[PDB]
């Protein structure tokens, strides 16, 4: 059974650059059986090369298969913004009746730095009525990843009661955009009056903060 | 041109059997010409080829090691389609099933690198009922909307199992949409946002409805989201 490895595993790349893709076999896979997909999130892959060399239809040109034996390799001559995916070889052998894949690598786009814009959602009167309050903050289309949201009730520190998660990078802009949940039960939130979402991010020179009072 | 349509999402109980369908068209079961294949995607195995079948004067049915004993992939000329039967499931059968299409033929030989892909079918294995979400607004202060830009959005919680279809304005709007990741919640359950950035001077002409679908539960929720 042909074990496909492919490397690096995760790669950062400015647009126009060159990006080299490679895939190891643990065995000769004959040139007629290598392909490539890119697979976008949410997406199924799509056929990018196969044959080895073969660019599918419709494929850009800065599209290319090469290789033989045991090390093929996938080049993008210059690389765009909409390129953002993971990108699999696969191999089929004929005898015995074997199809592998390789685990991925993924490309993921360089941009300049770019600041969130914030904001903060109160818990819906609907919700309330049934015992529980989410309060929501939103980090909209900021780059690089790494973020920093803290909570603040009354102007005390929340912690274990929050739970966050992250777009993939936009095939346009770039940008990664974040969400964060406070759950407090209803009787707690009743309890207090401001509630504040900060944010420390590399592309704000100081955090910004986003609060707003229960009632008002 | 040649479209593959699967199932919906499917939730499975441990020890039972998956079964899916693919309905093809734009080209036959039957032909000479293709391979059917179905294809599975996990986060902690990736892409995995599970079996084809094809027919030249007869049905023919190829399985991966990994399933064999287990796997049944049928074909309906009738109604055009292949199935896929998985029985005896884990949790290790939690993934998302593709079939696809293989009719690149290189000196006679099916490469079988795969030309036509279906949307995807997300299958969970558990034990928990389904269970569809509640649907809450977001909506933004009116001092946050001061500026050029209104921040509106749905919260979709306490559902199970993945996954939720959220659009917005029935597919209308689809600019600066972002819909996150759900989250599983000490309960069990997901809880999922959806957002959309829209300008502030629409936000008395314009009306923004969140359309939630939620299949495993024929839970359909239509929410307009007024700052």
């Known amino acids: 059974e042909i074990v496909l490895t492919q490397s690096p595993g995760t790669l950062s790349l400015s647009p126009g650059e060159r990006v080299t893709l490679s895939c190891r076999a643990s065995?000769?896979?004959?040139?007629?059986?290598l392909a490539w997909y890119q697979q976008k999130p949410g997406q199924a892959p799509t056929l990018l090369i196969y044959?080895?060399?073969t660019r599918a239809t419709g494929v850009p040109d800065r599209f290319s298969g090469s290789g033989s034996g045991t090390v093929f390799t996938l080049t993008i001559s210059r690389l765009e913004p909409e390129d953002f995916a993971v990108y699999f070889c696969?191999?089929?052998?004929?005898?015995?009746?074997?199809?592998?894949f390789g685990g991925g690598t993924k490309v993921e786009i360089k941009r300049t730095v770019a600041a969130p814009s914030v904001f903060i959602f109160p818990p819906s009167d609907e919700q309330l009525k049934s015992g529980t309050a989410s309060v929501v903050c939103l980090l909209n289309n900021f780059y690089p990843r790494e973020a920093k949201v803290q909570w603040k009730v009354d102007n005390a520190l929340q912690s274990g009661n929050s739970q966050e998660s992250v777009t993939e990078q936009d095939s346009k802009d770039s940008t990664y955009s974040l969400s964060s949940t406070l759950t407090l039960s209803k009787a707690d939130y009743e309890k207090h009056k401001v509630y504040a979402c900060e944010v420390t991010h590399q592309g704000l020179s100081s955090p910004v903060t986003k609060s707003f009072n229960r009632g008002e | 041109q040649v479209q593959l349509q699967q199932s919906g999402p499917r939730l499975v109980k441990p020890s039972q059997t998956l079964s899916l369908t693919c309905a093809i068209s734009?080209?036959?079961?039957?032909?000479?010409?293709?391979?059917w294949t179905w294809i599975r995607q996990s986060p902690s195995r990736g892409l995995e080829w599970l079996g084809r079948?094809?027919?030249?004067?007869?049905?023919?049915?190829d399985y991966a090691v990994s399933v064999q004993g287990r796997i049944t992939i049928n074909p309906d000329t009738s109604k055009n389609q292949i199935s896929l039967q998985l029985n005896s499931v884990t949790p290790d059968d939690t993934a998302v099933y593709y079939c696809?299409?293989?009719?690149?033929?290189?000196?006679?030989?099916?490469?079988?690198?795969?030309?036509?892909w279906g949307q995807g079918t997300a299958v969970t294995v558990s034990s928990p009922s389904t269970k569809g979400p509640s649907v809450f607004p977001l909506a933004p202060s009116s001092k946050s909307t001061s500026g050029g830009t209104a921040a509106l959005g749905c919260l979709v919680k306490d559902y199970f199992p993945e996954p939720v279809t959220v659009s917005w304005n029935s597919g209308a709007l689809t600019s600066g949409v972002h819909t996150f990741p759900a989250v599983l919640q000490s309960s069990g359950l997901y809880s999922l946002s959806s957002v959309v950035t829209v300008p502030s001077s629409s936000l008395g002409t314009q009306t923004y409805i969140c359309n939630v679908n939620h299949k495993p539960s024929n839970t359909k929720v239509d929410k307009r989201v007024e700052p």
């Open positions: 696809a299409r293989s009719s690149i033929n290189i000196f006679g030989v099916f490469v079988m690198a795969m030309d036509v």
């Open positions: 734009g080209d036959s079961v039957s032909s000479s010409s293709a391979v």
């Open positions: 079948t094809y027919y030249r004067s007869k049905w023919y049915d």
């Open positions: 065995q000769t896979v004959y040139n007629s059986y």
């Open positions: 044959g080895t060399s």
């Open positions: 696969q191999q089929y052998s004929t005898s015995p009746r074997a199809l592998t």
